[PDB]
Amino acid sequence: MQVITASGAIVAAKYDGGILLASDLSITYGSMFRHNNVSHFVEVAPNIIIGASGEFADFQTLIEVIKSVILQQQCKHNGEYLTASEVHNYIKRYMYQCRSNMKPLSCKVIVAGINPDGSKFLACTDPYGASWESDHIGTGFGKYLQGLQIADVVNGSFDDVKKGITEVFRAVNARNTTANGKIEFITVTPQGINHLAPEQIDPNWEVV
Amino acid sequence: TTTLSFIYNGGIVVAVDSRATGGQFIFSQTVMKILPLAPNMIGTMAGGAADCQYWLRNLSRLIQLHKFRYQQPLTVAAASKILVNELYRYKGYNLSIGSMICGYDNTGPHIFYIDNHGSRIAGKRFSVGSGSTHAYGVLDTCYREDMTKEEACELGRRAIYHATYRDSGSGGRVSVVHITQNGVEWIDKTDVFDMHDFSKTTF
Amino acid sequence: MLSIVGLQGPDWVLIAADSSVSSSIICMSENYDRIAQLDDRHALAMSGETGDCLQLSEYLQGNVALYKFRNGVELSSDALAHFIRHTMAKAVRKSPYEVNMLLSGYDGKPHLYFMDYLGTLQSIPYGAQGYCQYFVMSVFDKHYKEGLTLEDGKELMKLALNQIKQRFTVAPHGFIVKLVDKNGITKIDLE
Amino acid sequence: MLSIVGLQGPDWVLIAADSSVSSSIICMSENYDRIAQLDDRHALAMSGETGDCLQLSEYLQGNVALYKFRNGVELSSDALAHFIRHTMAKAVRKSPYEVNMLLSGYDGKPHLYFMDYLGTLQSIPYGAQGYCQYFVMSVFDKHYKEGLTLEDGKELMKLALNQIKQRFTVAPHGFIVKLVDKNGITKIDLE
Amino acid sequence: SDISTYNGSCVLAMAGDHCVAIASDRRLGVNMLTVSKDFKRIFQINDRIYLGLAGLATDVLTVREQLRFDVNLLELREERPIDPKKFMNLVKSTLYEKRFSPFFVTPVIAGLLPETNEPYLAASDSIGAFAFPKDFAVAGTCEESLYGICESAWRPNMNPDELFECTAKCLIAAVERDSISGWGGIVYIITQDKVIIKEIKTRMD
Amino acid sequence: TTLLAIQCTDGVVMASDSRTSSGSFIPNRATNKITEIQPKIFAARCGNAADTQFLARAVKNYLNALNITRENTDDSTILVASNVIRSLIVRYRQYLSAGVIVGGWDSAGPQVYSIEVSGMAIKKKIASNGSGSTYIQAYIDQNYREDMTMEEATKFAIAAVTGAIIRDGSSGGVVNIVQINADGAKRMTVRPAQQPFNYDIVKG
Amino acid sequence: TTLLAIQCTDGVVMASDSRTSSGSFIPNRATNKITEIQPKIFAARCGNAADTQFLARAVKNYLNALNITRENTDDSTILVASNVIRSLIVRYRQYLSAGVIVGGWDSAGPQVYSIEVSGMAIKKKIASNGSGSTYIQAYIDQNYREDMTMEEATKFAIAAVTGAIIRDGSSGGVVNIVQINADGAKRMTVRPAQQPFNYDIVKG
Amino acid sequence: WSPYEMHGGTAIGICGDDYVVIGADTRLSVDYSIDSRHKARIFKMNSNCMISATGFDGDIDAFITRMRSILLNYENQHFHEMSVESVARCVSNTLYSKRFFPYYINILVGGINSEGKGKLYGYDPVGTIEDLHYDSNGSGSSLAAPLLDSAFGTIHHNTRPFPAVSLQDAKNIVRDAICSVTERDIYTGDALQLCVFTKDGFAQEEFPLPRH
Amino acid sequence: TTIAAAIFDGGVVLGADTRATAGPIVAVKDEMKLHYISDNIWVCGAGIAADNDNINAVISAKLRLFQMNTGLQPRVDQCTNILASRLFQYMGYIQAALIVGGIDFQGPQVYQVAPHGSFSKQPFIAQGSGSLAAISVLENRWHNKMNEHDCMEMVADAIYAGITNDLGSGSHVNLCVIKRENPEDKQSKVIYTFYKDYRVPHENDRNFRLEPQINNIDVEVIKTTERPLT
């Protein structure tokens, strides 16, 4: 398990209308800010976004696997996509398979989607294959530089969850070396996936 | 762990502690370290607990398969040979099996020390485990061929008790089994806490 | 590091082996027969882990019996020695048998072969596997005479085993000696 | 990993030690007195490298004699035991003496102390250093009775040493047993 | 494996109603081998201070003798017994002076305050990181077992009888889950008037 | 870390980033990596933070020691500071992973010495050090001119350290500028809002 | 190694250095690090030379395999080349320490994909890789414009790879330029005499 | 590279005369970080038993999926739901099937057998099976085991009959032990999932625990 | 551990959780990680508890001896320099990641001192295992010249963030507010108010306990002796 070309932190949190996921659009080569405007999330289904923090090569391989499996089940079901729970279960089983083959995908993969029943589904699978469904999931330093800023507002209004995620990513930009650039926000709602305009979440620089 | 088995004129006495412990913590004190294999055969469990339990129940399966395939039951030498061959096929896989195949067959009492390493040693007195040295000391010092069933069972029980006292890896209750021509007999599970003589001031 | 010692005579071979089997620091048995009678004519003393020695002995004995039954002829001592050597040469490179052996056979002529886990085959008048060779070879060199009688041979083997007992730090609690002659492999006591 | 065994009685202490000194795989001597008579009253059985044991024994004996000469009083068995413990505690942290000892002394009362290279001091009715404890402690537990006679004590020590010989893989070729009583340290033979 | 695990130890101290109770396993073990069942890990440091050293027997005796050297010198130079807090700081100093070659013993100081007679528990790690639990201070290879049992079992304001009751039962539960610990227990109940030294029976395996 | 000391015609511009990094975590986001050894002598610090701060305090001690027996306290002070940085680094090369660019003004004028982590001290007109200096080596070579004044060099150093901040994860925060002329030393802080470039320069 | 592929409006400029290094020794001083996978698809190679050459030949095989069953041989060929580079790198990540920038022209127009040593493929307008790319990251960010034509991008890439050649020991030699437009691919070699900068840019 | 995350978390099982009370902390956490505050680790395998896995969560999920697969196969090929003893043997064999790539999970199989009696089986990662009256697994196993030993005295006196502790008393014992572990074990925390298998079937309760 | 000190308009607010762990087990649930250095300086420390306690006691003794001999108020940068030099001379072996928080003539100053001796003046600092969970709150809620109460709440919430998010942190939030006794008087005496258990998270308390404690262990007493306590 080795991370080289890494995607930065991800903070996903359920709010009233859906799941709000934020992450920088920068892939870092070690410590270098190598690639910009590279979304860490991939819309694998109209209501299922998949992000990952960690090696982005392993997240592109995982997205290839996910898209292939979704395409298989879509051809079988004449257009119907896999559900967010089914997609996350496949990611859990394929990442555990990779770990069991001793070639783990070194990326913590957040699956955020709306199941057809309308229930928000936010789950995460770590490189080892340990998966968990939660109302809010931070990956990378978004997990560490979080505190109660998400948990207090999770499942709340979009404004409250957005403010909490913005606080967490202000902390990330301040105290994460790999945090570079705008923080893209993606809303996975039962009405689809909307990429809100990326926001520069500036740390409080009156510290000096 | 501490398991012992000795052949005296009256049969095979197999006494085993019941402690499973890794590092310092005592994971259990009620571990059954004698797994029956045939109506008149058992296999002791020492070393790796999972390995001994899986391979002794697999040997029980193989013995039953042989007895149903062929009317003659699988002998104690043949059973220990099956087990030792299977365990040797996994040499280098860090299996840990210490196991005395104690049974009465057509050729009489038979104890075969079987180890993961593939050693299959016939003998009339064996002890396997961290505290097996203490059980060996008590046995070799107090063992007689002409001991009654009660005397032999108490000898095995006291050897296991002294092993439990002097070894951190041994403890719990001494499960004593008497194996005779007629079949395996499970004497009793005696708590070594009760066996300890607290009137003594030396230990 | 078990003490097996072979001594070839004009018409016999005295093959002795450490009779003490062991588990870690415990001498489990004091009469374990480490010498494997692959054939009625060949006794293979084996030094190594008890499991490896037992499995290799059983494989070789089964193959010798299978050769005797497939073809109505028994293996020679050179043929058996080179079959063991082929087995060890195969093993070392892939799945090694960690057993150093002394093959003593009588097929009308006495034969003693120094064999090791790698597969070095050498007919020897006397030899040993384990650390006992460091103690017994010299005594053989000092006291072996061509045409040695069977009684003188037993005396010399007893001297070698006594040297193992006295000077080897891990002194075997006893030895099992077998005479391999025209009458077959007979276990003997050297006193 | 040398076998030293101590057995404390009502008015005596039987201290036995492996009498076989060794260099690598060679048993250099079969009567090496591993028990060090630091005083006329105290015999210190030592298990460890022969050099470390000899140097530590000489240091302790010199210090005991120096205490006896500087002050017109001989060290007690508790005082000597704790002096040895202090020496080992100093050594372990800086320049460790890799010797595990059994200090048997009679100063009007029998005393047997389990001492190790680290410096754990414990008065014991019986004990052993080396792997022999794994073989002898149980026999003591099985056969030691309070008020044991000196003849019963010799029988029990003989039983323990026989267990070392029979079950310990590296069986000492012999033991040197010393009786530490009101008459001093006298070497004895247990047969 | 580990040097601390070499000599299995299990020292407990509990706070009662103006009384403390320091219990300890009585086993001197060498790794997996029981050498003795008469090993003293609890030492009286002062009339109202007892020190249980859970760890390497070598360092149990070394630390006990060094703190008897320090406490005796302090009481000679000051004509006064050492306070439980003063002795706690003394043990902290003793261990941190060897911080980088630490004694492999965790001390457990069970004392009564000189005037108020209140319980005073003070358990540190190998290097004097003293804690001052108002309820129970545990140490030795049974540390997790003792923590678990005493968290549920200890109750405030236990009289000397009840304090002995959990000290003994809770220590028995701890030692019986530690392979290298046990072989008898000793419980010192320190009260305003008397110290009650009860040798309790634990499993001898 | 990005260190960039420029010896100008009329002073010394020591630009630095403000990011202390513990792996991917930034313990200090507003780090003063340029330490005021003397009122007109500053030490930009890269490598181990503890080793570089010890180096700065020890060089303050060594330069005060230089003044124990002399009255020309502002004479050869920058060269002596570089020499003591170099002697401490070579003396403690096993334990100190510190590189220091010591620049300032003294009787000899403006000076900039780059002592490497190896302990190699070179008087440099343009000196750079740290992980972020790598990303801006070509930028410096293309945009550095010997004739730059302290203001021109200050702007160029802000731009270069900002580029290094953008491209280096280990380098970030604000651009700590120190402008040392004969009159004294002026500290400035170029916050990310006031930095000439942004992450947007990446990919155009 | 310096790799710099620029996706221009009217083509792709793949600039590279020509220095193969075995430690401090240069076994090949005129290396063709940009391999002609197809007449209008080239792979600039960084990392292990053997792994990158195997990658180039295997991608030639994979793109010919793509053409076994199709007649639109110049369709999605650059994207497929990047995908096969990425699948070989991830499949052989334990054994292949190869990074490849595959750029060229196909039915989709000019394209530049940067597959990293990790096996991360990103379509890039401006892609750089190798040890020398680090030294020129800031230079590229300051001098790269999205609107550069193939000639402007060729000049800028020559300048950037020359700066990397100057500042990197692993990067050196001539600037191997490949200009891929719809018409085809033109190779150029910018020798050190014809390179815009020299070692003299260091220290001014 | 170690393929396990060594996730902490305690599971305390208590077999009764006619019940089995397994209480496991929901929290999923390793290396001072809580991946999931709630992550159920006790699963109703069938109408006869429940399995409680503590350890690597990837291995918990994989082993629970494998056990559900094997129990479904047993229901299809042997025409009845696998019994608690049969599930226990299957758990032992399933864990041992990976003896050389062990599931780093400690298993408690608690159920109600054909006799109606409670049956708890404790496991190690490599598949040691043990028919137990009580067991503790996970990070706080060392903490919780003395609690159960005191509550029952089975370790103190092995051969004495296991005390006839009522279902509610056993549930309270598991709750108190899990709370003590949560107080002491950092990994144990968040919510307790207290599952009970009785003749009435599988019942589940969620009790808060100290998050800190 | 979660320790976090910030500088508010009138002073410094230091905070620390009260959980000491002996590995994966919570040894202490009321651990004191805020160490009094001088009347104006408090250090909240993480790392090795023994190292933190001893180094804080030693530097407190040094600055008490300083204030006695010289009659001078210890300086926060002085304490930080002494701490950093001591931690550097031990090459990081004294694992005391300290946060000095005090008020001297230069005003309220918060310094970090890494175990290896690297110090840094910062407005808000968080150290320990939960240092990231704390610093997030500190990053989002600290601003120049905030009043005492807002900084108290921010530092307590950062320690609480470390407590909940980090396993190595837990139990209560102890605060220590260094402030001038008269905030309007910059020359007034620098006093401190220590708020022990400033936050006592109710969701983090023991919520269940067997009222009848079930125990089937019987104590058999081998020997009893009673000895006087004097």
Ligand SMILES: *C(=O)[C@]1([C@@H](O)[C@@H]2C=CCCC2)NC(=O)[C@@H]2CCO[C@@]21C
């Ligand atoms: C920079 O060199 C750097 C900083 O910690 C820096 C050190 C010296 C001055 C104080 C802050 N050192 C490091 O170890 C990291 C990695 C590279 O740059 C750092 C941020």
Ligand SMILES: *C(=O)[C@]1([C@@H](O)[C@@H]2C=CCCC2)NC(=O)[C@@H]2CCO[C@@]21C
């Ligand atoms: C460049 O990547 C480099 C060259 O050998 C290069 C490899 C790929 C194309 C052929 C020549 N690879 C290396 O291992 C050295 C070190 C860094 O750059 C190299 C010169």
Ligand SMILES: *C(=O)[C@]1([C@@H](O)[C@@H]2C=CCCC2)NC(=O)[C@@H]2CCO[C@@]21C
């Ligand atoms: C905190 O860092 C921590 C505490 O023990 C802490 C140490 C310093 C001040 C006293 C209490 N140090 C540790 O070793 C553990 C590991 C997690 O953090 C601890 C709780």
